[model samples]
Target: TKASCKLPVKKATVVYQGERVKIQEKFKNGMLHGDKVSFFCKNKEKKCSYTEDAQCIDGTIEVPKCFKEHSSLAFWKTDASDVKPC
Candidate 1:
């Protein structure tokens, strides 16, 4: 079965963990079965809590608007995984 999506995602910003979402460590893994991987992205306006998820399709991996590259200086402020969840 063609059940994997190699996202152009790093481990820090585009937060994800199997079944659950947490920002503990880092890795580059593939999403399986067109399953929706719960990637944690935050709203800058409300940096405490607010998460949106990105789903993985057979050939394409979708990304959320709130997810950004930590390469920006503003990323130093905080992250969804580090903050409290709703």
Candidate 2:
């Protein structure tokens, strides 16, 4: 899963793992306006399973200090974990 926001986006939230992993951020005029937060389950849930190796069960993203809000772009590079059967 991946997500990003445009500047002047008063509020933004990137959600993963159902409600388990969530990233809340803020931006103002293309600048990081406030603190960013990430939430995730410490223990693996049945809904979140592992398809690859346990150590590779994560994602990554890159946040630039400055960029062209209109021209440039932000990105979150990540993969999805297999959701286990109930």
Candidate 3:
């Protein structure tokens, strides 16, 4: 038997710069076991939005850490999702 991921929202919001992205392309109702899901993150050095992915297994996936959440002041700053793609 397998379990499906209840929601990508938790990971999704943070993954896409604490908000949204081509965003619609990444979210769904459920992520089945053995399925692959992609997430976006930032590379400060490169100053670009990079891609990362996780595999859904029994409702768990290895979400990437390159993304970050920002404070109110930081929100006015640039975001990986809004930056050029790396």
Candidate 4:
């Protein structure tokens, strides 16, 4: 999934399928500074939200949260219904 953070961050890390992986995009000014990550399976899809960490930054490297604005998109298209958090 693709996402932009609401706050600024310094760095981030990603893990895929129980294995640690690298971040596809770099965090800059609370934004996604590079490519988005995608994992395709035979019968499933997975995704996550923005990630980063920095001092004095009000942002969080959070996964997609379930809510009214993106409930359908997160659950159906993004397949984030099963994911917990980043």
RMSD (Cα, Å) for all candidates, in order, is 3.9, 13.2, 5.3, 11.6
For candidate 4, the per-residue lDDT at 66 reads: 23
lDDT of each: 0.54, 0.27, 0.56, 0.33
| Cα misplacement distance, residue 43 of candidate 4 (Å) | 17
Per-residue lDDT of candidate 3, residues 61-82 (tens digit) = 6656654443455554556555
Best first by TM-score, ranked: 1, 3, 4, 2
**lDDT, candidate 3, residue 38?**
52
- Tens digits of per-residue lDDT for model 1, 5-35: 6655555344344444322233235665455
Which candidate, 1 or 3, has the higher lDDT?
A: 3
The positional error of residue 51 in candidate 4, measured at the CA in angstroms, is: 14
Q: Per-residue lDDT of 1-86 in model 2, one digit per residue for the tens? A: 33333332223222232333222233232323232432221113554423211111113233332212232332322223112323
List model 4 lDDT by residue over 1-86, tens digit each. 45444422122233333443333343333545232332221133433542222222123344322222223443354432234444
- State TM-scores per candidate: 0.61, 0.18, 0.60, 0.19
Which pairs clash in the backbone of model 4?
Answer: none
Q: RMSD, model 4, all Cα superposed?
A: 11.6
The backbone clash count of each candidate, in order, is: 0, 0, 0, 0
lDDT of 2 at 47: 41
Error of 4 at 47 (Å): 20
